[PDB]
Curated annotation (Swiss-Prot):
Full-length numbering of the shown residues: 606 to 899 of 998
Quaternary structure and partners: Heterotetramer upon binding of the ligand. The heterotetramer is composed of an ephrin dimer and a receptor dimer. Oligomerization is probably required to induce biological responses. Interacts (via PDZ-binding motif) with GRIP1 and PICK1 (via PDZ domain).
Positions of post-translational Phosphotyrosine modification: Y3, Y9
Catalytic residues, chain numbering: D153
Post-translational modifications: Phosphorylated.
Ranges per topology, Cytoplasmic: 1-280
Family listed: Belongs to the protein kinase superfamily. Tyr protein kinase family. Ephrin receptor subfamily.
Residues the record lists as binding ATP: I34, G35, A36, G37, E38, F39, G40, E41, V42, K60
Organism annotation: Homo sapiens
Tissues expressed in: Widely expressed.
Function: Receptor tyrosine kinase which binds promiscuously GPI-anchored ephrin-A family ligands residing on adjacent cells, leading to contact-dependent bidirectional signaling into neighboring cells. The signaling pathway downstream of the receptor is referred to as forward signaling while the signaling pathway downstream of the ephrin ligand is referred to as reverse signaling. Among GPI-anchored ephrin-A ligands, EFNA5 is a cognate/functional ligand for EPHA7 and their interaction regulates brain development modulating cell-cell adhesion and repulsion.
Cell compartment(s), UniProt: Cell membrane
The encoding gene: EPHA7
Protein name in the entry: Ephrin type-A receptor 7
Amino acid sequence: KTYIDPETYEDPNRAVHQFAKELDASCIKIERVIGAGEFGEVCSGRLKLPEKRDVAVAIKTLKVGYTEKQRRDFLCEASIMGQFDHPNVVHLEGVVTRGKPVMIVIEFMENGALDAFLRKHDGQFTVIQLVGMLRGIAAGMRYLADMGYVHRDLAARNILVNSNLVCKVSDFGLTGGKIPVRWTAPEAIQYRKFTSASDVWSYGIVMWEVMSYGERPYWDMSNQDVIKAIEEGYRLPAPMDCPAGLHQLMLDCWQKERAERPKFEQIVGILDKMIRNPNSAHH
């Protein structure tokens, strides 16, 4: 059981039907817009589910009159997401591909993106709560990594949070395009060498984003200033109250030699020790 790059499929859609269960549109309720995506509005709503008990769902719509080269790309997310089954990876309920408005139906994550969520609750979570959010994200990325999937766009804006503060990896897509530089490893930006090692550099920024409560990595520095800065050995500092051991794990994630960075397996260990005791996150 390892990820099947859909793009080896010829007919792109055959991937959707293998990985993403088609749902009935009459079993889907839209209640609320909660965002907008590349392809159209993200809504909150309900699915059932014969089984029983309406399940709360996020619903990503493909806006009407899409091009063929948006129904392929938009539904590429389902083909990837539906291959995954882990508590710290957003769950697919299924898709709508024909005969009805095109949708991806995803488990409802009450608290939305982790970066917008932490800005609204600035200073409300202890280190041990924050360590826990990252332990989750790291558990997710270890599973995605063991499955041979490379995310390429790990950022707090692409992590979703439920009402128990369980953090889940979302936004499946596998600096080419939207992959912005301030989350990307130097060898991914310069050489397009995308790996789990480069996801770990990005995980390191997510650590900074979390401990800073949704501060923008590198603040207002231009992409070019961030690249020269990182090239000179500049690394971001410990946000307010962020223990030195957590910031140290950040710095190891941000080693310029990709093989010197910890694997997600080790990151989960270092985070568990820290939950279990100061760590000590300074000692």
